[PDB]
Amino acid sequence: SGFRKMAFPSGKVEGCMVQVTCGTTTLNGLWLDDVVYCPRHVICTSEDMLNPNYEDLLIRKSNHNFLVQAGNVQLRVIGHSMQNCVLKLKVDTANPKTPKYKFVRIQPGQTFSVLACYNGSPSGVYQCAMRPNFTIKGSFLNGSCGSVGFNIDYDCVSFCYMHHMELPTGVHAGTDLEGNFYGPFVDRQTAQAAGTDTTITVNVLAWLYAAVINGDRWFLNRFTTTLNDFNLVAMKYNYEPLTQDHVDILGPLSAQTGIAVLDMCASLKELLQNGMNGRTILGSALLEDEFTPFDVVRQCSGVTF
Amino acid sequence: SGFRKMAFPSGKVEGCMVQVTCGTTTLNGLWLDDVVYCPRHVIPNYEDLLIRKSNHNFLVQAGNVQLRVIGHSMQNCVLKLKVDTANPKTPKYKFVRIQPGQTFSVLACYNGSPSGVYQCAMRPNFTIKGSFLNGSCGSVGFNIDYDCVSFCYMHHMELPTGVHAGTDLEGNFYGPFVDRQTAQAAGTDTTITVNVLAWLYAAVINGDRWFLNRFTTTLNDFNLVAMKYNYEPLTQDHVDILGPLSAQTGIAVLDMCASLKELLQNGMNGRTILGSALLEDEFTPFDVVRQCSGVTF
Numbered sequence: 165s166g167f168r169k170m171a172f173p174s175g176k177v178e179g180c181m182v183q184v185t186c187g188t189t190t191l192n193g194l195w196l197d198d199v200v201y202c203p204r205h206v207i208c209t210s211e212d213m214l215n216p217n218y219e220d221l222l223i224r225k226s227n228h229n230f231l232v233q234a235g236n237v238q239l240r241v242i243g244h245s246m247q248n249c250v251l252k253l254k255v256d257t258a259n260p261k262t263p264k265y266k267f268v269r270i271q272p273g274q275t276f277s278v279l280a281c282y283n284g285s286p287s288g289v290y291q292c293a294m295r296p297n298f299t300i301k302g303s304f305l306n307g308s309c310g311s312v313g314f315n316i317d318y319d320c321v322s323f324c325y326m327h328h329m330e331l332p333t334g335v336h337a338g339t340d341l342e343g344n345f346y347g348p349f350v351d352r353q354t355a356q357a358a359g360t361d362t363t364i365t366v367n368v369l370a371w372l373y374a375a376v377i378n379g380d381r382w383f384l385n386r387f388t389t390t391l392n393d394f395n396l397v398a399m400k401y402n403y404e405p406l407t408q409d410h411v412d413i414l415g416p417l418s419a420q421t422g423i424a425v426l427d428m429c430a431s432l433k434e435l436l437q438n439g440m441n442g443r444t445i446l447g448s449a450l451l452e453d454e455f456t457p458f459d460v461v462r463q464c465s466g467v468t469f
Numbered sequence: 470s471g472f473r474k475m476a477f478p479s480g481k482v483e484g485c486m487v488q489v490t491c492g493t494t495t496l497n498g499l500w501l502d503d504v505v506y507c508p509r510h511v512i513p514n515y516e517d518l519l520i521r522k523s524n525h526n527f528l529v530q531a532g533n534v535q536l537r538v539i540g541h542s543m544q545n546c547v548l549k550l551k552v553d554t555a556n557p558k559t560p561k562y563k564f565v566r567i568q569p570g571q572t573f574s575v576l577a578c579y580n581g582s583p584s585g586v587y588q589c590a591m592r593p594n595f596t597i598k599g600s601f602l603n604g605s606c607g608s609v610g611f612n613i614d615y616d617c618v619s620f621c622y623m624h625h626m627e628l629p630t631g632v633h634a635g636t637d638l639e640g641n642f643y644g645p646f647v648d649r650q651t652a653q654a655a656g657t658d659t660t661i662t663v664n665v666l667a668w669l670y671a672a673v674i675n676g677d678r679w680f681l682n683r684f685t686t687t688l689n690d691f692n693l694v695a696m697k698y699n700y701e702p703l704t705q706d707h708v709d710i711l712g713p714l715s716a717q718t719g720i721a722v723l724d725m726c727a728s729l730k731e732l733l734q735n736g737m738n739g740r741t742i743l744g745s746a747l748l749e750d751e752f753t754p755f756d757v758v759r760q761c762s763g764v765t766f
């Protein structure tokens with residue numbers, strides 16, 4: 165019993181965190197095999213930030229300009245290249261702590277663990293989701309650039325995010341490990357703003373099934389809904405449209421609890437209309453959207469209470 | 470910017486998790502140097518049950534390697550299995566007993582394999598609101614200070630309300646619990662007042678100031694109000710501990726107490742604080758200072 169926002173054990177990622185310095189700038193790098201991946205903005209100067217020409221800044225650098233530190237050991241840089249918004253530093257030593265890994269690009273609504281680091285040293289681990297507006301509501305301070313997001317399903321680490329910047333609203337933007345940004349963001353200090361955010365509907369439904377699994381049914385009703393009627397109501401509360409794919413994905417939880425997806429949608433519609441009336445669901449007074457259907461199946465029991 | 474329930478990096482603890490099997494029971498063990506610590510309920514008159522066991526009855530597995538048990542002893546509710554190999558991944562560590570209100574990280578494990586890490590607090594009723602399934606027994610709670618891992622909790626059982634109970638690493642239970650199948654219930658819980666205040670300071674640091682007012686209160690008047698809302702009494706020690714955050718934000722502790730008093734008597738009025746519609750009590754004053762400063766390990 166119980167339901168917590170749970171992160172993956174961070175050990176396999178901790179053994180990959182390094183410190184990358186270029187001139188006066190220091191940030192974090194990810195050391196996998198003989199390559200260190202880091203945000204390309206480490207090569208910028210205090211002016212460059214507005215309209216940096218990364219190709220022009222990089223051509224002026226040599227291998228010895230990049231200082232890479234793994235613990236108390238200096239790694240020698242023997243090559244460098246840029247792939248989109250990520251700088252790849254070829255080093256002379258392969259990381260002996262390199263886990264089995266993949267680089268995966270996630271879609272909005274997906275969750276991942278973040279190992280927040282400063283000066284190549286891990287400070288904390290937390291769980292979060294890629295928002296529909298492609299930002300993440302993380303907890304980052306200056307020097308956290310280069311911290312990574314990941315999932316560890318089985319013994320393989322799937323790297324999905326690298327931190328690049330904080331937007332004016334306090335939310336965060338970054339790239340996949342191939343340097344492609346999530347969202348319409350650029351690594352420039354130009355006026356950029358996150359689009360209007362929405363609630364991840366499929367995740368709220370999954371979390372309502374998790375509450376039924378742990379023994380709570382106060383929010384259910386005797387009604388059902390069509391998918392179309394549910395979306396017309398949901399859009400009025402800034403909820404993402406629920407697609408037939410989302411309904412298919414919720415199938416296992418529907419079978420385990422005995423509650424049809426469109427009947428759980430009818431209960432969600434009623435919760436949006438009425439609020440909670442002093443009650444909570446899994447210790448929360450708000451509708452929680454940072455647990456996917458897969459996270460619920462992983463954390464909750466296979467036997468409903 | 471941002472404020473999350475953050476756990477310590479779990480790597481130093483992951484390298485200590487092992488699987489302990491005795492007969493039909495399998496649970497988790499903590500392998501430090503040449504000793505494996507695990508709940509004694511893996512074997513009730515525990516002395517009588519233990520005397521009938523030999524070293525070869527305990528099967529200990531570290532990854533795909535079988536560890537040979539060469540001795541066994543009991544310390545309170547923890548079983549200590551002497552093994553033939555010292556753990557080469559043993560970090561610098563201490564066994565510490567925490568007080569209610571203090572927070573720690575939990576590395577939840579099944580069959581000696583870590584599955585997740587989460588942050589939580591020791592409730593005033595000595596239970597923890599964790600996330601554990603059958604097979605989680607032996608999972609541990611910890612904090613990190615520089616390079617030293619302070620082990621403070623080992624999971625033993627789930628209570629009928631869904632909350633969890635366990636011991637320090639010396640086998641002494643937190644709370645009036647015993648390690649057996651019998652009618653046990655968690656006492657009425659209270660809110661950790663000093664932690665809610667710390668989280669209100671964290672909200673001010675992150676730009677949330679709608680709840681601030683021009684008023685102050687005496688410590689006595691605040692406690693008379695807080696006792697009415699099932700909040701733990703706020704002591705002068707708690708006020709002293711909140712000193713740094715008071716100096717950083719410019720809001721005196723008793724000034725912030727008058728804000729909490731208004732939130733308790735009037736609610737949030739459709740508003741949230743740090744993305745929450747409830748008053749959050751699982752961040753200590755130190756957790757707030759650490760997260761809003763960037764301390765590393």
Ligand SMILES: O=C(N[C@@H](C(=O)Nc1cncc2ccccc12)c1cccc(Cl)c1)[C@@H]1CC[C@H](C(=O)N2CCCC2)O1
Binds near residue numbers: 205207307
């Ligand atoms: O804000 C800065 N850096 C980046 C940033 O956004 N970093 C941060 C990330 N997360 C949380 C943060 C919270 C508080 C402050 C910073 C945070 C940033 C800014 C603009 C565009 C990009 Cl891609 C990256 C400052 C100002 C320039 C300096 C910097 O990064 N330099 C590069 C080389 C010369 C100095 O550090």
Ligand SMILES: [Cl-]
Binds near residue numbers: 274
């Ligand atoms: Cl995805």
